[PDB]
Amino acid sequence: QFNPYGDNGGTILGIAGEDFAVLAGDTRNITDYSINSRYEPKVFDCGDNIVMSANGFAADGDALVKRFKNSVKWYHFDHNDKKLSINSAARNIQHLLYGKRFFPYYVHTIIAGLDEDGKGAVYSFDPVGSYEREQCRAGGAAASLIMPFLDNQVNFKNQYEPGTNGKVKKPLKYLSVEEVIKLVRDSFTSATERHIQVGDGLEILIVTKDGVRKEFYELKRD
Amino acid sequence: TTTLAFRFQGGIIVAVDSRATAGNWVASQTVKKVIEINPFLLGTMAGGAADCQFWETWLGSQCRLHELREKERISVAAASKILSNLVYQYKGAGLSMGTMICGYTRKEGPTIYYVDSDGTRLKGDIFCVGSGQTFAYGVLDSNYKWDLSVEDALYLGKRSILAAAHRDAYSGGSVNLYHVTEDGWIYHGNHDVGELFWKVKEEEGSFNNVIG
Amino acid sequence: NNYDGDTVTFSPTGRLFQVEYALEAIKQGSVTVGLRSNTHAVLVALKRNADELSSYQKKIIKCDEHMGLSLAGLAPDARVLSNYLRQQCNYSSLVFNRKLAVERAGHLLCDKAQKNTQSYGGRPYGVGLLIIGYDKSGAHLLEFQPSGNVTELYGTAIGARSQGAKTYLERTLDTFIKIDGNPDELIKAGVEAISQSLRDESLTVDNLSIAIVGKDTPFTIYDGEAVAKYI
Amino acid sequence: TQQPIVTGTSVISMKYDNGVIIAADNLGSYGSLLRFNGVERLIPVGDNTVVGISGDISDMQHIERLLKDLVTENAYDNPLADAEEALEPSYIFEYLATVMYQRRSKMNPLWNAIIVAGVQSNGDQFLRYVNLLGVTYSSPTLATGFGAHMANPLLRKVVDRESDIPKTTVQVAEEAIVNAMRVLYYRDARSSRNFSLAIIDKNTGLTFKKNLQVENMKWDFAKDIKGYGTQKI
Amino acid sequence: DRGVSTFSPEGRLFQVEYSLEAIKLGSTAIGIATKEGVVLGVEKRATSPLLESDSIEKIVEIDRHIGCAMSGLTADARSMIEHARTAAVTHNLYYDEDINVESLTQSVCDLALRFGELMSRPFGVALLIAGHDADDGYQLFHAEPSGTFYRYNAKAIGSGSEGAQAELLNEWHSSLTLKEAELLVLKILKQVMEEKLDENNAQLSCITKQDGFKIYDNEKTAELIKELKEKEAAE
Amino acid sequence: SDPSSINGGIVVAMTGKDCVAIACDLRLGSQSLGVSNKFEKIFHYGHVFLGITGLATDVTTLNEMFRYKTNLYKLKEERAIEPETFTQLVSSSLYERRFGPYFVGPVVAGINSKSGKPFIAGFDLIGCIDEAKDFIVSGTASDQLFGMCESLYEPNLEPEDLFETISQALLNAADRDALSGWGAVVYIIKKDEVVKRYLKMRQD
Amino acid sequence: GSRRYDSRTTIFSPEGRLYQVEYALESISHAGTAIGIMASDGIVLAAERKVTSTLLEQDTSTEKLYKLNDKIAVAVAGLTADAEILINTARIHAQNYLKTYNEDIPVEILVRRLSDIKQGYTQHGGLRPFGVSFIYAGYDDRYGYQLYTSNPSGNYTGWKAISVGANTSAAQTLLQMDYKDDMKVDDAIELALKTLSKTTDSSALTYDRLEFATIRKGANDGEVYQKIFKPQEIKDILVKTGIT
Amino acid sequence: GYDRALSIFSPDGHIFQVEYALEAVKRGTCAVGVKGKNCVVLGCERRSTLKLQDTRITPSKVSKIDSHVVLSFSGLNADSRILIEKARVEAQSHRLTLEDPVTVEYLTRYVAGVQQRYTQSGGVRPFGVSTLIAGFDPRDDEPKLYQTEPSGIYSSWSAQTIGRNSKTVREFLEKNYDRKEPPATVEECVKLTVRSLLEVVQTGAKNIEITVVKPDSDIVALSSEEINQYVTQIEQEKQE
Amino acid sequence: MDIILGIRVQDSVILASSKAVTRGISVLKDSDDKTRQLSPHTLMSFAGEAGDTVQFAEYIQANIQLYSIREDYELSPQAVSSFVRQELAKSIRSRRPYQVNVLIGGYDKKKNKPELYQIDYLGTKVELPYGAHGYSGFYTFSLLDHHYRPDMTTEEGLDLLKLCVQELEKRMPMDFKGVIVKIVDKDGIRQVDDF
Ligand SMILES: N=C1N[C@H]2n3c(c(Br)c4ccccc43)C(=O)N3CCC[C@]23N1
């Protein structure tokens, strides 16, 4: 019997800062126990200061990104070159996903950018289109390894101020872009150690008011 | 998942938890399980997250079209029936929905309809849906009165979700409260279950089984 | 006369009057100019207002990053044909990862217009189009007629009083074709060309509409104070 | 939904400094029966692209006809069909990838794994993969089926990352490809000795080699191997 | 007879040109755009005194940020309004935002030339579409059965249009207040109407960023009519 | 689960000298539960009689369908349909639902008004005609009916003797079937008189 | 194209009349007269066949009176072929109703249905209307004995006595003169035949030029019987009433 | 399918097929509607050119669309049945989906929409019918009276008439109907409705039909004798 | 849903229907009315698959109300039951059948007789002096077979109905939360508010 789905592995991570946002992902592509590519880009600049990644089954992932990029193009044609805001992009992606409710895109989608007040924004989707704005979200193979670490080191969960013994929480102070990138790199380094599908390379797309910048880092290739 | 809604003297209380799971894995603790259909109507999320989100936003669009055409606020009866008739068309295809459509109009007063993906549409005073529904029902049934104050009713809904969050493994995170009046719903905050549990334990004297 | 009731009827001399009447709608339209060098291609269009309270009707439509057109005649027909071009450009990019050649875009517009001239019930399109673009064989300018006839040119003009601009371009042919790597001078030549078609009115800041595409220049439209530099 | 009947095994390929190399054997298997011994599975498109196909042979012949029709169609009303508006490797791949994903989405796939190898107009090397699921990826080396498990490890020792490509000559690359084909003949039960090899170079163009054979084989050591444990004679 | 989609020798569609004549017979509608809002006004024109005039609905809401006034065969407008309302709501569903006034207008105008031998004839009604969005501010559009739409600072349609448009030519400037626009619509409506203008045979409306689209009460308009009378008697 | 034995019931038909007889039980049930003791399974359109066993909803539907069709037949033909012709109509009507059939076992009985010849016929659920000279059986106790009829039947029985034979065939067959019984009706049919008799039987 | 040859069968005149309906009514005015009379104990249907021949097989012939079901019959005036199309549709509708509700179709519901079919041909489709007028004679347990007529416009009305076809003006005046509410079937039989005898364009009214039918509760007890008269039976009733 | 555009514009901007449909309405028997303080009355003309009619079974001029709304008309009788059927189906569809009966305005808006659709759809002609739609909204005691016409325009009326000689009876209503004080009782409203028809009808015998609709689904048709008593009292006051 | 009972006495038809609505684990409601008035003298109770029950009942109600308005006439109970049977017989060979069983209690004003019809989801119709759907008949029919008389008063019918409900409450495993009882007679439909 023909199975229309597959699993290309990969892990992605989106974090929203005060006036910035990052969307990162490893560059390894796999089937079963084989490596297809050590460098296959997974996070894409979609225009209008929006970055996107659809992790899971790569064929569905490529199809969705391609259709969203197309939706941005037609949004410009139909509405006098108006900039597609991140909230509007998120609602649009819901309809793209729910359109195939009974034959779903087998992916976990994350988009990142800035909202209309210039504040950092990350949105997270399930395969059939349910979505939410979030501060922090890992997706894919090693998501279960990364999220607890982020709960602890970004949101300071289970951390209290010394001397008070559980009475006063550690205050939620804002993180810089340099600080966030450190946590992203350590997240993927740790995931590379303990998850076989994670490795080769890490590509990070950073979004600010100035535009979209890229950073690349080597990961272990075993 | 635990969601509830009940009618009382001062309108409707809606209370939900915030947890979403994929198997044993806790996907999110910050899920918005009350869908703001419009400033006067609320819907609750249980079963399929997308099915509830998508079709209740769609419901908001239909309600907006109704009041543009008829120059009058849509009834809770009519709004709930638009949704139930829609999901009935899809029956068999695999939609998953268990929701309370909540509103307060002039002609009806405070009204709640339980709508469900196999086509069920039930009017009622108290409804509770989700994996932790049985726990919340216990607190509701033993403490509910029509003549509850808005303050006490809000607490009752909060306390009932807490009961479910404690015992049901797939319920937790935080509690979202809403109070539905004739002039529209009012949001009454996000309440972390971790902090709420200890606060309630001390002030109420409950949960003596748990060491704090 | 007796042969102009529909598009499915030849006259005794072999003419199609409904098509000729559709051609007449273009002549009533406002003037628009097209010209190109070897590096860039330019559209210049005189926009028309209803009155002093009204806006000036837009004339130029973007089809892709590397292609777009200007219209003269029935504006809704231009919207239909430009939408079709947008789709075809888009099909080429999505399916073949290939930017649609300007010549092939002209062939597609010809065939779409032709079907409306040989069938009962329908009507010809009532608009003329000037398509500019930059593809793998450089800069291009096309002229579309709703008869179906599409022609590749160095320069041209359509609309009311377009003959004046067309004669100017025919004189200047050897000069403006050589304007390579200088967008401003090529637009100047186009603004000077469209000026040969003006009477009573002159080019103002909300009157003028300019578009350009080239080697390292995406199709962009200039309106308002962005064209004051060229007035 | 179907099942593959007559099938072709591995297709292997890699990039080198001035272009790409691709190879595949000439067998059409019918289950374990080695039925057809003269099957060409590398199909050139113009003088800049070679498409290598594994999996179902009936579907391969269909794809072959699609590519033939693509060349005919591109030439229509196209004065620059043999120049600026010729078919690029990237155009040919994207078309195939579209078809493959559409067919899997109708639950009626073309049961193949495909590698498109070529050189672009600007001299850039093109090498990308697509299969029955519509899954696509690129890498300095690419291989299908058994080749993925056995050829890639050998080819990756020559070009391990992007920066190794300019350091790799056509002689070194071809040598590596030919050795990989020998290894596959040793170890793949659905492979043959006869194969085809194609080189697409930005300077010397398309070189298509037919009727190549696996040679320099080691078998002599077999004479000393006796029994399965304790047997001496 | 002859095709419904036939061109004349001058290059105009017969049916479109004829529908424009039907619009000339319609009751007057006026729109004025300012930096404080857009005002829409109409002549009700009841055929008899026994007709309850508040049931005459020639000004209509499309969305909270978009209103619309009509002139001509007003029955034809109902499906156009339905499409406009659906388009406005649908876009909000797809994009979680308000739709641009121009985009809404363009969507309505796409229906216009969908006739032949689709509907059997063009619409016999013209629309003034007024609204506000964040990108282009307060806007007024004139949607015709030809499929063409022009943006206007001020515009009049219907039987008293050319006399009203000449008056709007002189009176409009870029610094008009909302109050000044209200009186100006009332003044020009009073000029071109057959019957004497009052709160029962004329109707006002406006669209502001803060309050959205609002049809004025008869009591509210009656005060503005009294204010108009006094300021005209003031010189 | 098996649609032909959810409701239960039986029909039997026999030929005699210048006469035919058709009989049926009165039970309708939901498997083990007895629901009705007044569910008659024999219908008539003019002088042509039709018994139907099987799924009760289809029994009712087909009666309504053949009443529909024989009424139109009569209006157009200006005469009552004959047993031979009606038999072909039943066959045609059943086969048109070849791949979504009515779960029934119809039985036709009657005398041709012109020739005076007695006629009976049977069908499977899909339209195959069984035109026996002697007898036709149908229903959940068809095996029992075949046994009774084969031994009790003899040709050229007079109307009042045929009544006894067919009655005893039905009664004793029904008493060996859980899903049949709860009353019984016998039609004795001659060229221009038909007598209907309800039989007394055990009610378990 | 094809527009050139379109007669446009469904348009108003400047006066607000439907051309084709009016012209179809003109056609019907040349058809043989049909009369219906309703009494307290039954209904009579009488109709004149159009200029016949001696070689026409009368006993197997039917051009005027048709059975729709056991309770309802119709008299036809106009194109016979058109009438049979509608008659078959009406027969089917009656059976559809009987299957659905397990009750005989009420007379008016059948009449409304056929009349709506006629109406459709005047408003859409671009086809010519049916050149037929019906007189419906029927019985149901709600209103009892009922007479209706319908014409190509699709309009229908109820009657105590009515005529369609040729010389309706003269026929209706004669019926209006002699009809009374307490009238019985045997009296109505006489009135119908006397009216046809005076209005006919033929020299004399004979059995071979007539079709006759009665709907009576003269059926043994609480039921209704339709009687389509045979040629010999029409000959006898002509002698009984003193016309021949 | 037959697609011919029958309703089209003429050079002077008129749609003649719609205008000729109004001429069919002009030919139809007169219909009148009058709303009192707590009721609405619908009066209808019956042409006495047709006697020997069976009045028990003949289609009545006023039709119930629901238990609380009625519809009368002037124009083609066969055309009106199609509109009445559609209106009745929509009324039940509304109850089924909204769980509330139609408002009088909604039902009017639907019927008017159907009429409009038949003026720009291919292969169809407009309805030769104008309607008067009257009743009370659910749980409301305010009287409602609306009018529709072939073009599809509709509006609310304190009192209105349609059909032949409607110009005359509208003349009567315009001078006799006071808005500040409408007919306070059922008697006064029926009297004014009968009076308005007597300007046009001929004999006050079986030529006048009267239907009274009150709040909460209270609809009754007056008999010959009841109407005859109004006819008698009106002329006895007139002899002065 | 669960238990629906019917009994036809001398001058009326009595329908009894359970109040419970259970969604798997919990009883969501204990006051549910499993009936729809089709016409002034005709009542229909129902039980079957969730959603389909109310959808079917309201669909039938709408159709009978439409007929009543069109003809200004109330259909007989027999005619209504035949319409309902055909709809279910049509439904059973559909893509997704209505899984709904019904009882139709009506008073025929023409014949001055009460009438009770039992129809299952297949379109199996029978006219009965008393009837039920599901397992309800298994517990109650032996009592009805014993005590039932055709000349019973309405009060005697209610008493026999109480005995049936008591037996159900004793031997049935499920708690159906009592029954709503409605009477259909010459004066129309009324609910017994204390049972
Ligand atoms: N962070 C979220 N993403 C969605 N989401 C949800 C689940 Br469970 C899940 C599992 C894998 C990937 C995404 C997922 C899920 O339940 N969600 C509800 C709101 C949207 C979502 N939350």
Ligand SMILES: [Mg+2]
């Ligand atoms: Mg690792």
Ligand SMILES: [Mg+2]
């Ligand atoms: Mg037995």
Ligand SMILES: [Mg+2]
């Ligand atoms: Mg037993």
